[PDB]
Each structure stands twice: as structure tokens, then as C-alpha cells.
């Protein structure tokens, strides 16, 4: 379906309470009375925006070029205050994952918005928050709701009556946010003075409950999810949850793994997550550099090009990275740099670069505001004539119609501290983009080379951002002047004469799942699709999109190939799992003494456990880990493995110097759980 890939889309991120109040009758419901501020002066109270308000503004969003709305969390949040004028208006403090937040509407309202968005050719992804319930104080159960969790109105439990249930972790507050055990098993804290009750995704009831809630959003039409705080709950559950969701529909998943930029201690773990979990990630690596190049001017175009190259080398599916200049957890771009030309440049960069851009609501209306909560002001106007509105609409159309933006390579063609001219190319489709961040200097551009075919090209933006026309002859662009602060875009597109795969999505699944191949040159007459040479049953076939069912074949990463008119396409990988997954805590007791830098990994006889690999790089299906060791000399971590299967595995130490020390003896043998979760505990064999 069109849900699988968002490569041709523009994502628009909406903080529901702050966008549009389409129904004033749900502003202050009796269920959660007293959390509404009609004056819009108490920044952490509900201001009244809702799901019906988003639906009423569909015409505006369509005209802007939005093709996927990312809705902030829609499920029932805390019904009380959490300290002075502080509420769950933002949606991240969930008390009931089965019900829509009453300030925003009900399930009918959600269904109506999603149905009307789809009628307007717009998809809806929902922000889903599995890490925690709501604010609590460990020493006082009367604060807020004490972390209470309900199942469609039926009480389940809170932080205080959990002794015999184990729905929450009880390990104290996070202190070191970079320590991986603390970040995942300790409580998320808020500087106001409270913690968020940390759900135990290793508890079978909670794992199935969260799975059911996510599946319910997809049953109601959602085209995918933005999964909150994926660095804060085990990554086995991310992969197992993604499995369940892809069995339901070929939706799109992206996870928020905040920060951990290149060169940092936890960076490789984030890259491995993006490459193996089945969940793509928000592009924080590029975000940092975008803000320093166009915002603070502390980095240059060389740094921006370097980060495009670095992310291009590390992320297997870099075209699934979701890019952004700002968001609801950082100051708005215009508060970093009030120059609107620099904002237009940053927007053009993400609109034409690899991956899919997410534009924070109101950027195009020139909203400004410092960090949370001042970056969550009310959408001020719906003016369709702003320069930014026009720019986004125009470039969104280019991204929908030119395959180079969706799937292309990226090649630097001209660079200095202020100017970046880069080229996207997908077979015969080419887009050359020039960006000059300096708003006071023009640059003479000579020696520019290109893959564009011969001819004269007008700026695709029609000079909106100071662009100019160019003349191309035999790969050379005639010398021209790039105006101060300008953005100029030159493009070429044509029909394909052979099958060209731009995307296969989702990137993981089991036999029988629907998978979508997006590209060009497939023809109108049905041809064939193979996975590792195995013919797949075709669900639908068009010139640019093929839907297939994953064949009942052996598990592992395999290559998808389209054959049309006897000619075969380029190959695109897809990870076939060994069956429906379960998320299992693997513990190895009494391992050998280790030194700083030494880490233990798990490996075994199925692709989920790396097929006996000892490789620990960003590759797909290699050794699993590393394990953590809060209970040293015992080590543990949580992994997604096929449910109800007998597996063989061993652990190994990867010393700081790269040396490998295997457990001795015979392989450990175990049968995995049939439910959502379970535990496999063994003793290290010396
Ligand atoms: C908000 C965000 O917090 C975490 O992110 C931290 C990250 O893990 C750290 O590494 C570090 O980031 C570095 C980064 O690595 C560097 O590359 C970069 O250069 O510098 C960064 C800044 O030093 O610090 C960030 C925090 O700045 C976490 O990992 C993220 O998942 C998280 N975002 C998402 O999670 C939540 C929770 O569901 C949402 O927040 C909601 O709940 C919060 C707590 O009640 C409310 O915010 C309060 O608490 C925050 C955390 O202590 C405070 O930062 C914030 O000022 C305060 O208002 C928040 O209003 C509410 O929305 C996020 O919206 C969601 O996107
Ligand atoms: O001519 C090919 C050459 O073009 C670009 O080099 C630019 C350079 O980026 C500018 O800073 C300035 O010095 O002009 C040069 C062109 O004369 C590419 O960046 C470079 O890779 C390529 O070889
Ligand atoms: O390479 C496949 C092989 O991997 C594992 O064998 C380990 C063995 O466990 C270690 O003790 C040491 O000898 O290195 C071997 C890898 O070269 C599995 O145990 C084995 O079943 C599997 O075939
Ligand atoms: Ca309302
Ligand atoms: Ca509520
Ligand atoms: Ca957690």
C-alpha cells in the first residue's frame, strides 16, 4: 500500500492541543476537569486543540504539500495536575493506552480524521509512548495518579500496588542518561520534580497490552507510528512489536532515539538499532549539523556534507531516516536564527535531501519560541501566501514527482564554507540543488559539473528564494552567480525503460506479510518478483508500485528483484524472520571477569541471533548485544527471537582489543516462549 514508504512525502508534526480547536465542547471535560486554560498563558495546561481541529484544517495541509501527518500522542493522558499548572496536554503521560484522550475527541473522532485525511491523499502516523505511564513521586502516592494504568477504563495498577503484578520497573530514577542500563530500567525524570512510572516491557501482560494498543491504532486506520523514547526501553521489544505491526499491515515505523551523534559512546548501538530492529530512526545526526550550519553558524557546509556522507555510510536504509530542523523538544529554528532566508534554506535542504522531511507545525507561519514549552505555542495563522508555505508546497511536489529525491544517491558538486551544491540521482532522474547560506554575499560558481542532460534549466522554485536558470552542456554547467542567501533547484525526470527498484518496505517481516516495492519501469502488465530467487505471489502490479506476499521461504536477509519484459531490476534487501517473534530476556550467569571495554554478546543458529556471527558492527543479523551487567558477573539483555522455537546459542566476550573469547563446551539449547515475552537463563560454560 502507500503506507509502507514515505520517501515521496512531506511529514508534518502536529502537537494536537496547540494546532486548532475544532470542537470547543471537549475543552474541559468532567473526567479531567480543571486542566484547561482559556487564556493561553499557562504554558503547560491544555489550550484546546483537538483531532476535529486537525480534520478541519485538511485543506490547508493538503495545499501546503503535506502527505503524512505525524500526530502527537492521542491516547488518554493523566486526568489530574502534576504540580502547578502542569498537565498531559502534550500526550506523553498515558493513563490508558486503549482510549483516545477526551480533550481531543473519542474513537469516532479519530476514525473520522483518519478517514478524511485518507480521502485527501494524506496519511496519518501516531506518536506512541510505550516507555511509561504518568507522573509520580515515590514517597507520595497522592501526587497525580500515582502512575495509574487502565485498560479501556478498567484499572490495572499503579506504582504502589505492583508487588504481585510487576507491571512497572522499581529501580529508581535515571541519574546518568548515557548509561544504557539506567536509561532503560530506571525512571524518566522531569526537572519539575517528578518521575514517570516506567513500564516493564519484560512483563508479559504489559508487553501484550502495549502490542494490542498499537495494533488498535492500525486497525483504526493509522498508517504507521512514531515510537517515543526507543533508547529508554529494551530493543528486543521494539523488534518484536514491529513484527506484530507488520503482520497487520505494511505500515511505516520510525523511532525516536534522541541524540547519540557520531563519535559518541552509544552511537553504534543506535545505528545497529536502525539497521536491525525493523524500526527506522529520526535523524538526530543530521539535525545537529543542520542547526549549526543554518542556525548558529558554528559549523560549515563542509560539516554538512561530511554528515551526509557519514550517515550514508552507516545507515543501511538511510532513505528511511526522518529529517528535521527542529521539533517539540528543542528551540524553534527562528529562535536560534531569526533570518527567514536561513530558515528557507534549511527547509529546502531537508525537502530535497535523502530520507523524508518532518516539518514541525507552524514553521511555515514563522513561529518562534525557545525550548519546551515555549516551542509549543498556538498555531498563529493559516496563511497560504507565506514564502515558506509556497516553498514547501513547491518542493513537496518535486519530491512526489522526481524519483531522484525519493531514492537517489547524493553527490557533492560544489562546496565552500557557505555554499553547498549537491546532486540527487536515481537512474535517469536527476535533481541538482544549490544552497548559499550567506545572506550578504553572492558567489561566482565556476567548474560545476552535473549529471543533468544537455539543455537550459529554469529554477524549479521560479526565483522564490533567489534562484536562477542554468545552461548545461556535456556535463558542465556554464558559470553563473549564486545570489545572496539563495536556493536554486534544477531537475530532470523521464520514464524508465527497465525496472528500477527505489524501495522495498517494510524492511522486515514473516512469510505472508504484504510488502511494497516502489520504483519505476515495472510496466502495466504483470511480470514477476523474486525474493532470493523464490517467486513471490503478486497482490497488485502498477508501473511504479508492486505489492507482494513474502514467500514461505527460509529466514534471513534476502534480495528482492523485479522482472519486467524479461529484464531484471537492481536488487533490494529484505529481512525474513524465522516466525512471529517473542521478546526474551537472555541472562548468562557467572561469566568470566572482564575489564573496561570488554562486552559480552549472544550468537546462535538463527538469523535473529546472527547465525553464529561474532561480528558486532552495524550489519544486519550479526552478533546480538552487547549484554549489560548491573548484576555482574551475571550479564543480560533482551532480544527478539521466533516464538515457540527450539534454538541453539552461545555467548562470547568481545575484549576491548577486538579479541573473541567464546564460552566453552556444547551449545546451550532452549525453547522460546509462545507468548509476547519470556526468559532464558543459563550459566556461562567454562
Ligand atoms: C525530551 C527527550 O529527553 C531525552 O532526551 C535526552 C537524550 O537522551 C540525551 O542524550 C540528551 O541529548 C543530547 C544529545 O545526545 C546530543 O546529541 C545533543 O547535541 O544535545 C542533547 C541535549 O543535551 O538530552 C536529551 C534531553 O534534552 C529522551 O531520551 C527523549 O526520548 C525525550 N523525548 C521524548 O520523550 C518524552 C517522554 O515521553 C517526551 O517528553 C514529555 O515528557 C517530558 C517529561 O515529563 C516533558 O519534558 C520535561 O522533561 C524533559 C526530560 O527531563 C526536559 O528535558 C524538559 O525540559 C521538560 O519539560 C515533555 O514536556 C513532554 O513532552 C518528549 O516530548 C519526547 O519527544
Ligand atoms: O570542477 C570539478 C570540481 O568541482 C567542485 O570544486 C569546486 C570547489 O568545490 C569550490 O570550492 C571552488 O574551488 O571551485 C571548484 C571548481 O572549480 C567539486 O567540489 C570538486 O569535487 C570537483 O572536482
Ligand atoms: O561457526 C559456526 C559454529 O559456531 C559455534 O562454534 C564455535 C564454538 O562454540 C567455540 O567453542 C569455538 O570453537 O568457535 C566455534 C566457531 O568457530 C557453534 O557452537 C557451532 O555449533 C557452529 O557450528
Ligand atoms: Ca477542543
Ligand atoms: Ca485524560
Ligand atoms: Ca524504560
Curated annotation (Swiss-Prot):
<dbReference type="InterPro" id="IPR017853">
    <property type="entry name" value="Glycoside_hydrolase_SF"/>
</dbReference>
<feature type="binding site">
    <location>
        <position position="50"/>
    </location>
    <ligand>
        <name>Ca(2+) 1</name>
    </ligand>
</feature>
<feature type="binding site">
    <location>
        <position position="48"/>
    </location>
    <ligand>
        <name>Ca(2+) 1</name>
    </ligand>
</feature>
<feature type="binding site">
    <location>
        <position position="259"/>
    </location>
    <ligand>
        <name>substrate</name>
    </ligand>
</feature>
<feature type="binding site">
    <location>
        <begin position="231"/>
        <end position="232"/>
    </location>
    <ligand>
        <name>substrate</name>
    </ligand>
</feature>
<feature type="binding site">
    <location>
        <position position="102"/>
    </location>
    <ligand>
        <name>Ca(2+) 2</name>
    </ligand>
</feature>
<dbReference type="InterPro" id="IPR013780">
    <property type="entry name" value="Glyco_hydro_b"/>
</dbReference>
<dbReference type="InterPro" id="IPR014756">
    <property type="entry name" value="Ig_E-set"/>
</dbReference>
<keyword id="KW-0378">Hydrolase</keyword>
<dbReference type="GO" id="GO:2001070">
    <property type="term" value="F:starch binding"/>
</dbReference>
<keyword id="KW-0119">Carbohydrate metabolism</keyword>
<dbReference type="InterPro" id="IPR006047">
    <property type="entry name" value="Glyco_hydro_13_cat_dom"/>
</dbReference>
<feature type="binding site">
    <location>
        <position position="329"/>
    </location>
    <ligand>
        <name>substrate</name>
    </ligand>
</feature>
<comment type="subunit">
    <text>Monomer.</text>
</comment>
<feature type="active site" description="Nucleophile">
    <location>
        <position position="228"/>
    </location>
</feature>
<feature type="binding site">
    <location>
        <position position="26"/>
    </location>
    <ligand>
        <name>Ca(2+) 1</name>
    </ligand>
</feature>
<comment type="function">
    <text>Converts starch into maltose.</text>
</comment>
<dbReference type="InterPro" id="IPR002909">
    <property type="entry name" value="IPT_dom"/>
</dbReference>
<dbReference type="InterPro" id="IPR013784">
    <property type="entry name" value="Carb-bd-like_fold"/>
</dbReference>
<keyword id="KW-0106">Calcium</keyword>
<dbReference type="InterPro" id="IPR002044">
    <property type="entry name" value="CBM20"/>
</dbReference>
<dbReference type="Pfam" id="PF01833">
    <property type="entry name" value="TIG"/>
</dbReference>
<dbReference type="GO" id="GO:0046872">
    <property type="term" value="F:metal ion binding"/>
</dbReference>
<dbReference type="InterPro" id="IPR006046">
    <property type="entry name" value="Alpha_amylase"/>
</dbReference>
<feature type="binding site">
    <location>
        <position position="131"/>
    </location>
    <ligand>
        <name>Ca(2+) 3</name>
    </ligand>
</feature>
<feature type="binding site">
    <location>
        <position position="93"/>
    </location>
    <ligand>
        <name>substrate</name>
    </ligand>
</feature>
<feature type="binding site">
    <location>
        <position position="198"/>
    </location>
    <ligand>
        <name>Ca(2+) 3</name>
    </ligand>
</feature>
<feature type="active site" description="Proton donor">
    <location>
        <position position="256"/>
    </location>
</feature>
<protein>
    <recommendedName>
        <fullName>Maltogenic alpha-amylase</fullName>
        <ecNumber>3.2.1.133</ecNumber>
    </recommendedName>
</protein>
<feature type="binding site">
    <location>
        <position position="376"/>
    </location>
    <ligand>
        <name>substrate</name>
    </ligand>
</feature>
<dbReference type="GO" id="GO:0005975">
    <property type="term" value="P:carbohydrate metabolic process"/>
</dbReference>
<keyword id="KW-0479">Metal-binding</keyword>
<dbReference type="Pfam" id="PF00686">
    <property type="entry name" value="CBM_20"/>
</dbReference>
<feature type="binding site">
    <location>
        <position position="184"/>
    </location>
    <ligand>
        <name>Ca(2+) 3</name>
    </ligand>
</feature>
<dbReference type="InterPro" id="IPR034849">
    <property type="entry name" value="CBM20_novamyl"/>
</dbReference>
<feature type="binding site">
    <location>
        <position position="76"/>
    </location>
    <ligand>
        <name>Ca(2+) 2</name>
    </ligand>
</feature>
<feature type="binding site">
    <location>
        <position position="232"/>
    </location>
    <ligand>
        <name>Ca(2+) 3</name>
    </ligand>
</feature>
<feature type="binding site">
    <location>
        <position position="21"/>
    </location>
    <ligand>
        <name>Ca(2+) 1</name>
    </ligand>
</feature>
<keyword id="KW-0326">Glycosidase</keyword>
<feature type="site" description="Transition state stabilizer">
    <location>
        <position position="329"/>
    </location>
</feature>
<dbReference type="Pfam" id="PF02806">
    <property type="entry name" value="Alpha-amylase_C"/>
</dbReference>
<dbReference type="InterPro" id="IPR013783">
    <property type="entry name" value="Ig-like_fold"/>
</dbReference>
Amino acid at each position: 500500500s502507500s503506507s509502507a514508504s514515505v520517501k515521496g512525502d512531506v511529514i508534518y508534526q502536529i502537537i494536537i492541543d496547540r494546532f486548532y480547536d475544532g470542537d470547543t465542547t471537549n475543552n474541559n471535560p468532567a473526567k479531567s476537569y480543571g486542566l484547561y486554560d482559556p487564556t493561553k498563558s499557562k504554558w503547560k495546561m491544555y489550550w484546546g486543540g483537538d483531532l476535529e481541529g486537525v480534520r478541519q484544517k485538511l485543506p490547508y495541509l493538503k495545499q501546503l504539500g503535506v502527505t503524512t501527518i505525524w500526530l502527537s500522542p492521542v491516547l488518554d493522558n493523566l486526568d489530574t495536575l502534576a504540580g502547578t499548572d502542569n498537565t498531559g496536554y502534550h500526550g506523553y503521560w498515558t493513563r490508558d493506552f486503549k482510549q483516545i484522550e477526551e480533550h481531543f475527541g473519542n474513537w469516532t473522532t479519530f476514525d473520522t480524521l483518519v478517514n478524511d485525511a485518507h480521502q485527501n491523499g494524506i496519511k496519518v502516523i501516531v506518536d506512541f509512548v510505550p516507555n511509561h505511564s504518568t507522573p509520580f513521586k515515590a514517597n507520595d502516592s497522592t501526587f497525580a495518579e500515582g502512575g495509574a494504568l487502565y485498560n479501556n477504563g478498567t484499572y490495572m495498577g499503579n506504582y504502589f500496588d505492583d508487588a504481585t503484578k510487576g507491571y512497572f520497573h522499581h529501580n529508581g530514577d535515571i541519574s546518568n542518561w548515557d548509561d544504557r542500563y539506567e536509561a532503560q530500567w530506571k525512571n524518566f525524570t522531569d526537572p519539575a520534580g517528578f518521575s514517570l512510572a516506567d513500564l516493564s516491557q519484560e512483563n508479559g501482560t504489559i508487553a501484550q497490552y502495549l502490542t494490542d494498543a498499537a495494533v488498535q491504532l492500525v486497525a483504526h486506520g493509522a498508517d504507521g507510528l512514531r515510537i517515543d523514547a526507543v533508547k529508554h526501553f529494551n530493543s528486543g521489544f521494539s523488534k518484536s512489536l514491529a513484527d506484530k505491526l507488520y503482520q497487520k499491515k505494511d505500515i511505516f515505523l520510525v523511532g525516536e532515539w534522541y541524540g547519540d551523534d557520531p563519535g559518541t559512546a552509544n552511537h553504534l548501538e543506535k545505528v545497529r538499532y536502525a539497521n536491525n530492529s525493523g524500526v527506522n530512526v529520526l535523524d538526530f545526526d543530521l539535525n545537529t549539523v543542520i542547526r549549526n550550519v543554518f542556525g548558529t553558524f558554528t559549523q560549515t557546509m563542509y560539516d554538512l556534507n561530511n554528515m551526509v556522507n557519514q550517515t550514508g555510510n552507516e545507515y543501511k536504509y538511510k532513505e528511511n531516516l526522518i529529517t528535521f530542523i527542529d521539533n517539540h523538544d528543542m528551540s524553534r529554528f527562528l529562535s536560534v536564527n531569526s533570518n527567514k532566508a536561513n530558515l528557507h534554506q534549511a527547509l529546502a535542504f531537508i525537502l530535497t535531501s535523502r530520507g523524508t522531511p518532518s516539518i514541525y507545525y507552524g514553521t511555515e507561519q514563522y513561529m518562534a519560541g525557545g525550548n519546551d514549552p515555549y516551542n509549543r505555542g498556538m498555531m498563529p495563522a493559516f496563511d497560504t501566501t507565506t514564502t515558506a508555505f509556497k516553498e514547501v508546497s513547491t518542493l513537496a511536489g518535486l519530491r512526489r514527482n522526481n524519483a531522484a529525491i525519493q531514492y537517489g544517491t547524493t553527490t557533492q558538486r560544489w562546496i565552500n564554507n557557505d555554499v553547498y551544491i549537491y546532486e540527487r540521482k536515481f537512474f535517469n532522474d536527476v535533481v541538482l540543488v544549490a544552497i548559499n547560506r550567506n545572506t550578504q554575499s553572492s558567489y561566482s560558481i565556476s567548474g560545476l559539473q552535473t549529471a543533468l542532460p544537455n539543455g537550459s534549466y529554469a529554477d524549479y522554485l521560479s526565483g522564490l528564494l533567489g534562484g536562477n536558470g542554468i545552461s548545461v552542456s556535456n556535463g558542465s554547467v556554464a558559470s553563473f552567480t549564486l545570489a545572496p542567501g539563495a536556493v536554486s533547484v534544477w531537475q530532470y525526470s523521464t520514464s524508465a525503460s527497465a525496472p528500477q527498484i527505489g524501495s522495498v518496505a517494510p524492511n522486515m517481516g514473516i512469510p505472508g506479510n504484504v510488502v511494497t516495492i516502489d520504483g519505476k519501469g515495472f510496466g502495466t502488465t504483470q511480470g514477476t518478483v523474486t525474493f532470493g530467487g523464490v517467486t513471490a505471489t503478486v497482490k497488485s502490479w502498477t508501473s511504479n508500485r508492486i505489492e507482494v506476499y513474502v514467500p514461505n521461504m527460509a529466514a534471513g536477509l534476502t534480495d528482492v528483484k523485479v522482472t519486467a519484459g524479461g529484464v531484471s531490476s537492481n536488487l533490494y534487501s529484505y529481512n525474513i524472520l524465522s516466525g512471529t517473534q517473542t521478546s526474551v530476556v537472555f541472562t548468562v550467569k557467572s561469566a568470566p571477569p572482564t575489564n573496561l571495554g570488554d562486552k559480552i554478546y549472544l550468537t546462535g543458529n538463527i538469523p535473529e541471533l546472527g547465525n553464529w556471527s561474532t561480528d558486532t558492527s552495524g550489519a544486519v543479523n550479526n552478533a546480538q548485544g552487547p549484554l549489560l551487567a548491573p548484576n555482574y558477573p551475571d550479564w543480560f539483555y533482551v532480544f527478539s527471537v521466533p516464538a515457540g522455537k527450539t534454538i541453539q546459542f552461545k555467548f562470547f566476550i568481545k575484549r576491548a582489543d577486538g579479541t573473541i573469547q567464546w564460552e566453552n563446551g556444547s551449545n546451550h539449547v532452549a525453547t522460546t516462549p509462545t507468548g509476547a515475552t519470556g526468559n532464558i537463563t543459563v550459566t556461562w560454560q567454562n
